[PDB]
Coordinates of C-alpha atoms and ligand atoms in Angstrom, one line a residue:
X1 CA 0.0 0.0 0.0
X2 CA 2.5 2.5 0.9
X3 CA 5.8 0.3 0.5
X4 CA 4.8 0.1 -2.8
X5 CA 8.8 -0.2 -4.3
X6 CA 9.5 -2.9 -1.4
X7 CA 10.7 -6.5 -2.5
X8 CA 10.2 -9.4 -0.7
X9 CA 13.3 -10.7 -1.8
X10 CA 15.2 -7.9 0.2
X11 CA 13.7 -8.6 3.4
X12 CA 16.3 -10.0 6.4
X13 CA 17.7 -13.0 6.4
X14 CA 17.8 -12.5 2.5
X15 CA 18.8 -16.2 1.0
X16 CA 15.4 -17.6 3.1
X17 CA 12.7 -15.1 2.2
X18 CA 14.2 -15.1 -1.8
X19 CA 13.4 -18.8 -1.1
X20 CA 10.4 -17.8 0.3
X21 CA 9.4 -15.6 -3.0
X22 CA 10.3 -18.4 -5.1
X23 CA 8.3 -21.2 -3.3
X24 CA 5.2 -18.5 -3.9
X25 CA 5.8 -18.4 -7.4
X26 CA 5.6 -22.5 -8.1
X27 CA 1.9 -23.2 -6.8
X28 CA 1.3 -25.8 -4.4
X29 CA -2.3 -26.5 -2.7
X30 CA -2.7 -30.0 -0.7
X31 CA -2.6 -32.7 -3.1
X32 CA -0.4 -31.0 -5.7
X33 CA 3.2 -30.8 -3.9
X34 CA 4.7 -32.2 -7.8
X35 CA 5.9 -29.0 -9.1
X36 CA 7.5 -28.0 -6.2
X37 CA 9.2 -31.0 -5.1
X38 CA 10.8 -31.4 -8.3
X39 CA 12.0 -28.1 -8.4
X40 CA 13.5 -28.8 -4.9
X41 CA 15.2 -32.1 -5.7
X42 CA 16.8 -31.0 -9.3
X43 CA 17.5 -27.7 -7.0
X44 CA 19.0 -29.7 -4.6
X45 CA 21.1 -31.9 -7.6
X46 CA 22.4 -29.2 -8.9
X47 CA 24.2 -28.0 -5.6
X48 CA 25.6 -31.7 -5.5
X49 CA 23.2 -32.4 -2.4
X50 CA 22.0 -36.1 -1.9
X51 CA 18.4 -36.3 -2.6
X52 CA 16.7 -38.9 -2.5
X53 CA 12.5 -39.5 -2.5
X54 CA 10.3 -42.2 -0.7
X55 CA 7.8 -43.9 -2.3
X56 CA 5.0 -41.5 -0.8
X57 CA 6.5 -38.7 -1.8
X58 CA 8.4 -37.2 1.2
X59 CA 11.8 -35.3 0.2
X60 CA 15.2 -35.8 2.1
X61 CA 18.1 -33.9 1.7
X62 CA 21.6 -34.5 2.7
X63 CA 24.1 -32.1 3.6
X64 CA 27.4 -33.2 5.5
X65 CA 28.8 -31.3 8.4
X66 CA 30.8 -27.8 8.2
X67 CA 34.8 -29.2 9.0
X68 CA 34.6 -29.1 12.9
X69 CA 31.4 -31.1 13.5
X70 CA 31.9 -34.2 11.7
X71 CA 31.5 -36.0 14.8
X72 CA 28.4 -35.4 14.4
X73 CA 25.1 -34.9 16.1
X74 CA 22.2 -35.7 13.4
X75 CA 19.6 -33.3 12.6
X76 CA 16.7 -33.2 11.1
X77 CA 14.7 -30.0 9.6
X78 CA 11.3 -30.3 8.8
X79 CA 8.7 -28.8 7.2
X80 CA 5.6 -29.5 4.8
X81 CA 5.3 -28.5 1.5
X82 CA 1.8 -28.1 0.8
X83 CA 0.1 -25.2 1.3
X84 CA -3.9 -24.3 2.1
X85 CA -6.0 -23.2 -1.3
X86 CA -8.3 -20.7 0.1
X87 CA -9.2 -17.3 -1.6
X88 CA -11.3 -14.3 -0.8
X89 CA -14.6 -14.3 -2.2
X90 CA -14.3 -12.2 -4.9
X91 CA -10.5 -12.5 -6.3
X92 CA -9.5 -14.6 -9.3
X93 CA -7.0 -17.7 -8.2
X94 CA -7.0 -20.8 -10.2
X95 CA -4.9 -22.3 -6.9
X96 CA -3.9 -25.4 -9.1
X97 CA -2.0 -23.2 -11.6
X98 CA -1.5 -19.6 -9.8
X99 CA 1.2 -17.7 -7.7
X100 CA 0.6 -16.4 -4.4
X101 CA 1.5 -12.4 -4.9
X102 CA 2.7 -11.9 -1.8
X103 CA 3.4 -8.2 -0.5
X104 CA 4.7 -6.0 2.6
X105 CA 2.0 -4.2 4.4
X106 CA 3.5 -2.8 7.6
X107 CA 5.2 -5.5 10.0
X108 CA 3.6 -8.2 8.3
X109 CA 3.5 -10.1 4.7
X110 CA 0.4 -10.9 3.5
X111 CA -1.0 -12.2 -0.7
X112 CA -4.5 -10.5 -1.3
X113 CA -7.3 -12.4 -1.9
X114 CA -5.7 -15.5 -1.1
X115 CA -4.2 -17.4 1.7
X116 CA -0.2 -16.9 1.9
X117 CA 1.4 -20.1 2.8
X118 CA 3.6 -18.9 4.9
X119 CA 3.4 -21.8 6.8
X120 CA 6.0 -23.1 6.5
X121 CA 6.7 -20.7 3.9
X122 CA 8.6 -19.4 6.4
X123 CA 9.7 -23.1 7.8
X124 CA 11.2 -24.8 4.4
X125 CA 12.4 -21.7 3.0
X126 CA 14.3 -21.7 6.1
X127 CA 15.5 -25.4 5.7
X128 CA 16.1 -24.2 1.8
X129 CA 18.1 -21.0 3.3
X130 CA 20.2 -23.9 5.8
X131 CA 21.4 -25.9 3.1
X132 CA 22.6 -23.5 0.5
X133 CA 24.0 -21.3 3.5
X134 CA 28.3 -21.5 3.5
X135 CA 28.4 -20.1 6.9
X136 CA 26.1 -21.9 9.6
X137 CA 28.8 -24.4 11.2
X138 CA 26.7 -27.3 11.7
X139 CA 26.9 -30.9 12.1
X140 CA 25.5 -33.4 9.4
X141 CA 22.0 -32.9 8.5
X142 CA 18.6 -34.0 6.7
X143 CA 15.6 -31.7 5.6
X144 CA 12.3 -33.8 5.6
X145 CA 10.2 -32.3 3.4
X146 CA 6.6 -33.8 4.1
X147 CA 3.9 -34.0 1.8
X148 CA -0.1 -32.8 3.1
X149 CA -0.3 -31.6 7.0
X150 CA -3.7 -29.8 5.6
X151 CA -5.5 -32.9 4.2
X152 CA -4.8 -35.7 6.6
X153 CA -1.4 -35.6 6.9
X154 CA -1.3 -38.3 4.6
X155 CA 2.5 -37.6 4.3
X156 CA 3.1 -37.8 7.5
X157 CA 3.0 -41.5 8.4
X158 CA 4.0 -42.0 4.4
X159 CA 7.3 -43.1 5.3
X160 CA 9.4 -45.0 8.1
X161 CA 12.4 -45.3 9.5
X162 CA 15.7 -46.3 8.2
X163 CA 15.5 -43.1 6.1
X164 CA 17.1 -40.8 8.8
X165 CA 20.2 -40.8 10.9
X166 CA 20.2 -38.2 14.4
X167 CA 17.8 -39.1 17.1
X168 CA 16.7 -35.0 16.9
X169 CA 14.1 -33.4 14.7
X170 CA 13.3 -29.5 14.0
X171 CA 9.6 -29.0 13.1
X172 CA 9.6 -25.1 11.7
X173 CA 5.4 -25.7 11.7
X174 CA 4.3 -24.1 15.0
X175 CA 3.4 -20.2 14.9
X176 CA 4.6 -18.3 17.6
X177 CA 8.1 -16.8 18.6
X178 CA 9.0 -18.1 21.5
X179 CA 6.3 -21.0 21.7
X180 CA 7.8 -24.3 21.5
X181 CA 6.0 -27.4 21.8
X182 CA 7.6 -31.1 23.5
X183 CA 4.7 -32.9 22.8
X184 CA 1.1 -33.7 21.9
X185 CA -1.8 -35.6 22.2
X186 CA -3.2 -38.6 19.9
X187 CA -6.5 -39.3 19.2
X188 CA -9.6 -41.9 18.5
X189 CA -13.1 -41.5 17.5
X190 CA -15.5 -43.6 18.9
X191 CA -19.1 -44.6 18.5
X192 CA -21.5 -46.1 20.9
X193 CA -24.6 -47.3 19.2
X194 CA -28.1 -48.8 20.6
X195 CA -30.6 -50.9 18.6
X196 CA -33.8 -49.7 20.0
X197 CA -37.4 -50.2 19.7
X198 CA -40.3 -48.2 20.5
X199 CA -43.7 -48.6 22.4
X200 CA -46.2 -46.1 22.1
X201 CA -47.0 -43.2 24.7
X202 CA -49.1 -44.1 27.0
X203 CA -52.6 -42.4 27.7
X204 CA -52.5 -38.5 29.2
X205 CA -48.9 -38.6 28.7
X206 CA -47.8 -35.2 28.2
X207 CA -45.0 -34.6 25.8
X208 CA -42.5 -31.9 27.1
X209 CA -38.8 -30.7 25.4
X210 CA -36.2 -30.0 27.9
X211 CA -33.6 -28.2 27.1
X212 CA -30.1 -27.5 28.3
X213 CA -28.0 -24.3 26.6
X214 CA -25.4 -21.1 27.0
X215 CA -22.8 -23.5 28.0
X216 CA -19.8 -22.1 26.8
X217 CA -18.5 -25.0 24.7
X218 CA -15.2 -25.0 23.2
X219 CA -12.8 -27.6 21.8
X220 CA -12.3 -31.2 23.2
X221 CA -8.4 -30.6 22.9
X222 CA -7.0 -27.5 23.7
X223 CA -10.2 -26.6 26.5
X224 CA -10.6 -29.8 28.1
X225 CA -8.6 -29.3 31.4
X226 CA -11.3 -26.1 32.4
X227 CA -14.4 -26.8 34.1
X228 CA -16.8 -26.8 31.1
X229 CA -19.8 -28.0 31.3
X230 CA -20.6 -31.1 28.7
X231 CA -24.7 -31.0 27.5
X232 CA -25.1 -34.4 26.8
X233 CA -24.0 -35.5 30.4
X234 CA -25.9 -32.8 32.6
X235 CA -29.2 -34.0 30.9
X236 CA -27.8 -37.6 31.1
X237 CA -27.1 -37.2 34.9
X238 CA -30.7 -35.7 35.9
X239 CA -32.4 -38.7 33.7
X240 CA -30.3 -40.9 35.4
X241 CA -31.4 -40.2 39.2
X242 CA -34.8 -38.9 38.4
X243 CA -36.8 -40.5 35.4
X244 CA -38.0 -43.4 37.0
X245 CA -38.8 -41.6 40.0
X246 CA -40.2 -39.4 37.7
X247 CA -42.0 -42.3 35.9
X248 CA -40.9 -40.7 32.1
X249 CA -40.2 -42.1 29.4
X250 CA -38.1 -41.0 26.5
X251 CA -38.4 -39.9 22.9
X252 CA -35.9 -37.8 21.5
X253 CA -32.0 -37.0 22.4
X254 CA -29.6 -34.9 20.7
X255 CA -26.8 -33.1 21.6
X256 CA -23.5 -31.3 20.6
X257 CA -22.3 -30.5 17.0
X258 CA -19.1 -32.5 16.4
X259 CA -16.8 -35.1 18.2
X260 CA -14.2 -32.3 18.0
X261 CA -16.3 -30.0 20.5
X262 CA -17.1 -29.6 24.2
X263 CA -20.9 -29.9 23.4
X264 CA -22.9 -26.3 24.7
X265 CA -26.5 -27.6 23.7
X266 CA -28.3 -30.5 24.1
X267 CA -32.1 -31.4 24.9
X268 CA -34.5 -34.1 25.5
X269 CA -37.7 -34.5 24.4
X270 CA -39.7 -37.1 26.9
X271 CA -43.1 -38.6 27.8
X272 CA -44.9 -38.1 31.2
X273 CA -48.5 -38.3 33.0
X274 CA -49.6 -35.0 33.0
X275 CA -49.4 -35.2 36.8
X276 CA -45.7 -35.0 37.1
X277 CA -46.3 -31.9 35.2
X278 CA -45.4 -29.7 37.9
X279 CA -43.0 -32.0 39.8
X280 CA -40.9 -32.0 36.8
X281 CA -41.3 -28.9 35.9
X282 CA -39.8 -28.2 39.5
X283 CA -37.3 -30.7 39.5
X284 CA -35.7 -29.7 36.5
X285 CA -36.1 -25.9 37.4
X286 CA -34.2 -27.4 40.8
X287 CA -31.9 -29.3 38.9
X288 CA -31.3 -26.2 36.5
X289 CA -30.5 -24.3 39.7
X290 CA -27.9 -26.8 41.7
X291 CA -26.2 -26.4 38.5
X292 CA -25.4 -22.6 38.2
X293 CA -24.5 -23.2 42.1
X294 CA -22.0 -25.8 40.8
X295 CA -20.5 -24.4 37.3
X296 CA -21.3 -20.5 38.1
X297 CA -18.0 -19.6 38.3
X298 CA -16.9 -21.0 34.9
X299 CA -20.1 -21.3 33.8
X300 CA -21.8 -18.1 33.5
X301 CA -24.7 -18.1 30.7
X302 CA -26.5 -21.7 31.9
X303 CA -30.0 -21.6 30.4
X304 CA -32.4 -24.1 30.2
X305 CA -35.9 -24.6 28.7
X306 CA -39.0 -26.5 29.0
X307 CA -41.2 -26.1 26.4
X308 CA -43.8 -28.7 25.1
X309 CA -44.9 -30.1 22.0
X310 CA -47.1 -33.4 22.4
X311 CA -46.0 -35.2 19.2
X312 CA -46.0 -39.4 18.2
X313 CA -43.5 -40.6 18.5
X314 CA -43.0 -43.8 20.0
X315 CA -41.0 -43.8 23.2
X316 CA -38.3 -46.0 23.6
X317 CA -39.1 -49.5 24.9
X318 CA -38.1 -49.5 28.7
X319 CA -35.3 -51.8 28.7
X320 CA -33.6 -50.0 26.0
X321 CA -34.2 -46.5 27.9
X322 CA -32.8 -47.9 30.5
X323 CA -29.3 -49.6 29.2
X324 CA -29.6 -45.8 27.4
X325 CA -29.2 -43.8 30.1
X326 CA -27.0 -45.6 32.6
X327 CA -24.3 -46.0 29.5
X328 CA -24.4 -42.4 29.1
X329 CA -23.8 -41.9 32.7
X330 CA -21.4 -44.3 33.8
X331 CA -19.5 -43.6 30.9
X332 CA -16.8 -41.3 31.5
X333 CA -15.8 -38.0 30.2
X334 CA -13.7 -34.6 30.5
X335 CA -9.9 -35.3 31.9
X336 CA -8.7 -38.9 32.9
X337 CA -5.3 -38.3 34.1
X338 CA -2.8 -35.2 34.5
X339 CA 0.9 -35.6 33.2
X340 CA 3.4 -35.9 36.0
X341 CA 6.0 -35.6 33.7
X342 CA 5.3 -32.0 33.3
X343 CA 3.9 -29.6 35.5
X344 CA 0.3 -29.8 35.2
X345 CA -0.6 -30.8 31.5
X346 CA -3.6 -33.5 30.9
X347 CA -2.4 -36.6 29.9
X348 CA -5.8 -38.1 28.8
X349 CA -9.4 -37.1 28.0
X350 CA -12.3 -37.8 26.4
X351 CA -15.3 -36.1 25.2
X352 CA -19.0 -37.2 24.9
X353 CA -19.2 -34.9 22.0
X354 CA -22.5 -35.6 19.8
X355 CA -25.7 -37.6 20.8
X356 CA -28.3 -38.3 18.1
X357 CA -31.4 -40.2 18.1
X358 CA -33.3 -41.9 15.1
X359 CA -36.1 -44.4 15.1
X360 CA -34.5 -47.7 16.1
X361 CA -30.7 -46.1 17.0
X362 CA -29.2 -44.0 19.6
X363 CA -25.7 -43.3 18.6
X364 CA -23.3 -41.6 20.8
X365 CA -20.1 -40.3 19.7
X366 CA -16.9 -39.5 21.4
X367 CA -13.6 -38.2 20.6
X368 CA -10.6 -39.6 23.5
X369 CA -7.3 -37.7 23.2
X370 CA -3.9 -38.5 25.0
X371 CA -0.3 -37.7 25.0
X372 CA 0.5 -41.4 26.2
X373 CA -0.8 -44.1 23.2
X374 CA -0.9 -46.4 26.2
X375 CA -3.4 -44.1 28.0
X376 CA -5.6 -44.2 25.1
X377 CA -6.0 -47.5 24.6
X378 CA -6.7 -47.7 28.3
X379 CA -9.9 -45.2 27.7
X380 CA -10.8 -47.3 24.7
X381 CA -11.5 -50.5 26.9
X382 CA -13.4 -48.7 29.6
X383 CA -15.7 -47.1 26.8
X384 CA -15.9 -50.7 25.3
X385 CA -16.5 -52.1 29.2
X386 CA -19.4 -50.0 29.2
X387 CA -20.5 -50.5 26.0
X388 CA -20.5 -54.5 26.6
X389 CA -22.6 -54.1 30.1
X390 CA -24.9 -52.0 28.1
X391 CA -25.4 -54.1 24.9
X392 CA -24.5 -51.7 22.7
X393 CA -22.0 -51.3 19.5
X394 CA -18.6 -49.5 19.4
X395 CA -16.1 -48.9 16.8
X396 CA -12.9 -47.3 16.6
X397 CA -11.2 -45.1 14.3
X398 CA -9.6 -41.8 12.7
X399 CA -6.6 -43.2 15.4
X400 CA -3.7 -41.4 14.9
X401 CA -0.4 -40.8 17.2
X402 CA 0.3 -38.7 20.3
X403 CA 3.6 -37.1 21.6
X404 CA 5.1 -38.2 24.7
X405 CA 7.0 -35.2 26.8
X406 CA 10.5 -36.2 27.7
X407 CA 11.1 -33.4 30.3
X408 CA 14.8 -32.3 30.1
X409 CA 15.6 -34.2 26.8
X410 CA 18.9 -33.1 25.2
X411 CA 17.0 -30.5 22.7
X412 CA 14.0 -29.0 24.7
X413 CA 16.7 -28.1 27.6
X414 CA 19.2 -26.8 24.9
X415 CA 16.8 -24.8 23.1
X416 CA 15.5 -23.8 26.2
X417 CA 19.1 -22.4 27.6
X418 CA 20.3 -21.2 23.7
X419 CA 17.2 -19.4 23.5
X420 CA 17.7 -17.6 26.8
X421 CA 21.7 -16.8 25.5
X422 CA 19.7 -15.1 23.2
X423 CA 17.1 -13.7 24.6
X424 CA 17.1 -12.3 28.5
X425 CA 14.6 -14.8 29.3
X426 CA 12.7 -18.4 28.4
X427 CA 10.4 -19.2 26.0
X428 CA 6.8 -20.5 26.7
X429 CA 7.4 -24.1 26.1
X430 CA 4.3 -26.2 25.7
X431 CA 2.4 -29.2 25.4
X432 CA -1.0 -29.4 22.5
X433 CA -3.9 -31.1 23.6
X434 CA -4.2 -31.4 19.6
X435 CA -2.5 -33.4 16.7
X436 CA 0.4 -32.2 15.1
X437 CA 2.4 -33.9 12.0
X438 CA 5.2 -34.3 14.5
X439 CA 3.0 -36.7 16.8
X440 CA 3.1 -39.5 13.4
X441 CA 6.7 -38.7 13.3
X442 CA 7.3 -40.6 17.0
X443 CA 5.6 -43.9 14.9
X444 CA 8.7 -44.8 13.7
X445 CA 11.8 -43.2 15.6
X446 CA 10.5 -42.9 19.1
X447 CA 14.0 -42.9 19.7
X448 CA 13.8 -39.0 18.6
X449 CA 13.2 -36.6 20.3
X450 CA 12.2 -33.5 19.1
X451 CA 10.6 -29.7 19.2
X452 CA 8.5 -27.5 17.2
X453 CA 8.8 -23.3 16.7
X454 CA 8.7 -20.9 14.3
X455 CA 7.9 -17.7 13.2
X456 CA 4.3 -15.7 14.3
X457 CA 1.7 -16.3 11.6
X458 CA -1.6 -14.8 12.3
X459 CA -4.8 -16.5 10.5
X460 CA -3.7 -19.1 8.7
X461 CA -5.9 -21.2 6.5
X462 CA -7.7 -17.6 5.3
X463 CA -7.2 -14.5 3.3
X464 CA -6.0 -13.0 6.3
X465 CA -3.0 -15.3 6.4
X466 CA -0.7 -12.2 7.5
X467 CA 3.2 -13.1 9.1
X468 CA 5.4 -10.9 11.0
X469 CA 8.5 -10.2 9.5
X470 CA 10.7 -9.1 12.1
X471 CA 10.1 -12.5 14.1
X472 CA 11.1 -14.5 10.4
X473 CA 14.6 -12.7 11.5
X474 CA 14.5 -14.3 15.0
X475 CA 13.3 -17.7 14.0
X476 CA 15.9 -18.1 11.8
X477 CA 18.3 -16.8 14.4
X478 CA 17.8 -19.7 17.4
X479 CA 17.2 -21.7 14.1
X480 CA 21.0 -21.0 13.7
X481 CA 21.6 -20.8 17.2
X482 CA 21.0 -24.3 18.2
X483 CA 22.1 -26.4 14.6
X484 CA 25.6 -24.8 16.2
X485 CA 24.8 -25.7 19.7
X486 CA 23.7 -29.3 19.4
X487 CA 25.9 -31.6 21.0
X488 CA 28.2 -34.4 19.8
X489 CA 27.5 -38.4 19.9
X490 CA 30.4 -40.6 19.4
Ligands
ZN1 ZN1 -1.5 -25.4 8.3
ZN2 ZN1 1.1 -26.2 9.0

C-alpha cells in the first residue's frame, strides 16, 4: 500500500525469504506438492546435495557437516510442502496453476485475496536458506520435506524409518516466537450405538422438550482441562437419578455439533402423565438451579428450557431406555489423568461430544485424546466395558499418534538455555492437547526426540494469512543458534 517499491526478496535474512518468493511463485495447494518438489530435488542436484525420494513422496536432503562437527550430532529440519487453497470471495486464483503475490503491508507479509502459505513458507524456505548457507557451522544434516499436513497428513506416516540418521528433529510448523512445543496428544473417534425399539405413549402422557444451553462449549483438545460443562452428560445425569422416580419415558436426544467439541447444547424431548407436570417442571427448574450453584464460576450463561410439543412418537421400549441412560452416565468424560512428567498438562481425555437419536438407533459419539498411546487405549476399553454391560456397539477409528513429553531431553533443555543466551529470558514451552504432524513422526523413531517453533503467523488457512516479518529474522536466528549448539555423539 505505501511500500509500494519494497521486495520481498530484500527482506532479512535475504537467502530464506528469496526462497520464500520463489516457493510463492511454483503453486502448491494439498494434493499438488509435484511442481515443487521437483523443483527442490533438481535444486538440490544441482548444488551436488544427496536427494533422494520415498515412495510416498516425502523429500530428504543431505548435507554433511561444516569441517569441525563431523562428529556429528544428526539433525533433522522439517517442514511441509503443501500449502492451504483458500481465496477471498471475490478475487481470481486458479490455486492449481496460480502464484501467491505476496506483499509488505507494515510489519507483516500478506498475498491478497488469497491465503499466503507462509506456513511453512517461512519453515522450508528456512530449511532451503540452511542448506545453500556457507556459513552456519553445523553438524551433518537432513531436511524432511513432508507432503499434506492440511488434508490428513497423509505424508506424515508416508514413510518410516531407516530413512534418517540423528535421534533430533526441527519441526519449523508451530506459529509463535517463543512458543515451543515437546509434545502432543493422539486421538480416536469412537461410536456407541443402541438398537432400540419403541412402544407407544401411553394415555394423558404429556409430551414436554427439555432443554439444556449457554454453555460455553469450546474444543475437546486445547479446552478440556477447564471446568466446562458437557450438554449431553448434565441432561444424562438428571435422567439418570430422576426419570424413574419421575415415571418418564423417553423420545428424543440430541446433543453437541461435532466429536471435536465440548458440546454447549443439548435437549431431550420425553413422555410423562400430565401429573408429574409440575413435579418435573420443578425438578428440573431445581436441577437447573444446583447447576449454576455448581458451574457459576466458569459457567456463567446456563440456560435451560421447558417447552412442550405433544408429538407421536414412539418412546423408547423400557429396557432400552434404561441400558440408554446408565451407559451415558457411567461412561466417562472430561480429563482422565494429569501428566506428572510435566507440570500440570492432561495426559488423557475424552469427550462425549455428539448424541443423536433416530427411530431404532441411539448413537453416541466420542472423541478420547492422550499424549501417552498407552493411555488411550486404556480409555478405549473402559468405553468398550461399558458398551458390553450396556449391549450396545462401538467402533474405533480416525486413530492417529500422540507425543510423549521427555522433560529435560537433550533438545528441549538446549533450546531452552540457547534461547535464553539469546534472549534475557525463556520461551513459553508447551504441550497441544491437539494433533500435530510431529506426533506420526514418533511412529517410527520414538527414539527421537524432538521440538516445534517458528515464526508468528496470524490467520492461517484464510485470506487473512498475514506473518510478521521481524520474528522471520528471530526464528531463523535460534534456528541457527542451536544447529551450532547441538551436541556431539560418538
Ligand atoms: Zn497449516
Ligand atoms: Zn502447518
Amino acid at each position: 500500500m505505501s511500500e509500494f517499491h519494497s521486495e520481498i526478496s530484500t527482506l532479512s535474512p535475504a537467502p530464506l525469504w528469496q526462497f520464500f518468493d520463489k516457493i510463492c511463485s511454483i503453486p502448491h495447494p494439498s494434493k499438488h506438492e509435484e511442481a515443487l518438489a521437483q523443483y527442490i530435488v533438481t535444486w538440490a542436484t544441482e548444488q551436488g546435495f544427496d536427494v533422494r525420494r520415498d515412495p510416498t513422496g516425502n523429500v530428504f536432503i543431505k548435507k554433511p557437516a561444516t569441517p569441525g562437527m563431523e562428529n556429528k550430532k544428526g539433525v533433522v529440519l522439517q517442514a511441509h510442502i503443501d500449502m492451504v487453497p483458500q481465496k477471498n470471495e471475490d478475487t481470481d486464483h486458479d490455486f492449481t496453476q496460480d502464484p501467491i503475490q505476496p506483499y509488505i503491508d507494515g510489519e507483516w507479509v500478506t498475498a491478497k485475496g488469497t491465503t499466503l502459505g507462509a506456513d511453512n513458507g517461512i519453515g522450508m524456505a528456512s530449511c532451503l536458506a540452511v542448506l545453500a548457507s556457507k556459513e552456519i557451522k553445523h553438524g551433518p544434516i537432513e531436511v524432511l520435506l513432508t507432503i499434506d499436513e492440511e488434508a490428513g497428513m497423509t505424508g506424515a506416516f508416508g514413510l518410516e524409518a531407516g530413512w534418517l540418521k540423528g535421534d533430533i528433529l526441527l519441526n519449523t510448523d508451530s506459529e509463535q516466537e517463543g512458543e515451543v512445543y515437546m509434545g502432543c496428544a493422539g486421538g480416536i473417534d469412537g461410536a456407541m450405538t443402541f438398537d432400540i425399539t419403541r412402544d407407544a405413549i401411553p394415555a394423558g402422557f404429556i409430551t414436554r422438550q427439555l432443554t439444556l444451553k449457554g454453555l460455553k462449549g469450546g474444543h475437546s483438545g486445547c479446552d478440556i482441562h477447564t471446568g466446562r460443562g458437557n450438554a449431553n452428560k448434565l441432561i444424562g445425569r438428571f435422567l439418570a437419578g430422576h426419570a424413574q422416580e419421575l415415571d418418564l419415558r423417553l423420545v428424543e436426544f440430541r446433543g453437541g455439533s461435532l466429536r471435536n467439541a465440548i458440546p454447549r447444547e443439548a435437549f431431550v424431548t420425553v413422555a410423562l402423565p400430565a401429573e408429574n407436570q409440575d413435579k418435573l417442571a420443578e425438578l428440573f427448574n431445581y436441577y437447573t438451579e444446583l447447576l449454576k450453584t455448581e458451574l457459576g464460576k466458569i459457567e456463567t450463561d446456563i440456560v435451560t428450557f421447558n417447552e412442550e410439543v405433544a408429538t407421536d412418537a414412539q418412546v423408547f421400549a423400557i429396557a432400552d431406555q434404561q441400558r440408554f441412560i446408565a451407559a451415558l452416565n457411567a461412561c466417562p468424560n472430561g480429563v482422565m489423568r494429569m501428566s506428572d512428567e510435566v507440570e500440570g498438562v492432561v495426559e488423557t481425555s475424552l469427550n462425549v461430544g455428539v448424541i443423536t437419536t433416530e427411530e431404532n438407533k441411539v448413537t453416541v459419539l466420542c472423541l478420547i485424546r492422550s499424549l501417552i498411546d498407552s493411555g488411550r487405549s486404556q480409555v478405549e476399553g473402559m468405553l468398550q466395558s461399558v458398551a458390553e454391560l450396556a449391549g450396545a456397539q462401538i467402533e474405533f477409528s480416525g486413530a492417529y499418534p500422540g507425543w510423549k513429553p521427555d522433560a529435560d531431553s537433550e533438545i528441549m533443555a538446549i533450546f531452552r538455555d540457547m534461547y535464553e543466551g539469546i534472549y534475557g529470558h525463556k520461551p513459553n514451552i508447551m504441550v497441544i492437547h491437539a494433533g500435530l504432524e510431529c506426533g506420526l513422526f514418533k511412529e517410527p523413531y520414538p527414539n527421537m526426540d524432538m521440538v516445534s517453533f517458528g515464526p508468528t503467523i496470524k490467520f492461517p488457512h484464510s485470506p487473512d494469512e498475514k506473518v510478521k516479518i521481524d520474528t522471520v529474522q528471530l526464528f531463523w536466528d535460534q534456528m541457527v543458534a542451536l544447529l551450532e549448539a547441538i551436541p556431539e555423539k560418538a
